[PDB]
Amino acid sequence: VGLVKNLALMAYISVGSQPSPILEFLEEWSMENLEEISPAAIADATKIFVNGCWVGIHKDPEQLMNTLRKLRRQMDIIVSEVSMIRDIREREIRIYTDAGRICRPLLIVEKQKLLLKKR
């Protein structure tokens, strides 16, 4: 009892993707790479983790996360299975793309009104 489980009707498992397009897209932006960076510049910044690999450092999470969300919404460079997590308390953006990340679809609500209109 409790060990055996069953998925939910809407539950879906990520099949898996590749991190290369994401790495290239984050590299084009103003993202200093982890290999050449002043250690003193890590405090006032946010550490980006992709598939558990600490790479690059950014100085504007509030915009980077919005760009990532819009890009994923448009389904062009990042597949819908990828997930970007935003950690507010500690500045860390941990992105994952390996398989096995159980997920489900949810509607989007911009301010107080859904996008699933009559159209």
Partner 1 sequence: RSCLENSSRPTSTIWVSMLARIGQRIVATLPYIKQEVPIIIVFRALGFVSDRDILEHIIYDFEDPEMMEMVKPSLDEAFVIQEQNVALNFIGSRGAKPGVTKEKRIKYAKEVLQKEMLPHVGVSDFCETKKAYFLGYMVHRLLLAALGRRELDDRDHYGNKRLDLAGPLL
Partner 2 sequence: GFVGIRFCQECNNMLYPKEDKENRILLYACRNCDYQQEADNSCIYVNKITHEVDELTQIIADVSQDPTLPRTEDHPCQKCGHKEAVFFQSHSARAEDAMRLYYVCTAPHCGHRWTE
Q: Note whether 103 binds partner 1 by CB under 8 A.
A: no
CA distance 3 to 6: 10
Q: Note whether 71 binds partner 1 by CB under 8 A.
A: no
- In terms of C-beta density within 10 A (0-12 exposed, 13-18 middle, 19 or more buried), how is residue 118 classed? exposed
Question: Scanning the structure block, which residue is given the tokens 């069953």?
Answer: 6
Report the residue from 91, 93, 95, 96 that binds partner 2 according to the rule CB under 8 A: 91
Q: How far is the CB of 86 from partner 2 (least distance, A)?
A: 9
Query: What is the size of the binding site for partner 2 (CB under 8 A)?
Result: 5
Report the residue from 24, 27, 53, 63 that binds partner 1 according to the rule CB under 8 A: 53
Report the residue from 35, 36, 62, 76 that binds partner 2 according to the rule CB under 8 A: 62
Which whole-number Å values give the CA distances from 87 to 55, 61, 90, 116, 118, in the listed order?
Answer: 16, 10, 6, 28, 35
Classify residue 52 by its DSSP letter: T
The residues of the shown chain that bind partner 1, judged by CB under 8 A, are: 13, 15-16, 34-35, 39-40, 42-43, 47, 51-55, 89-90, 98-102
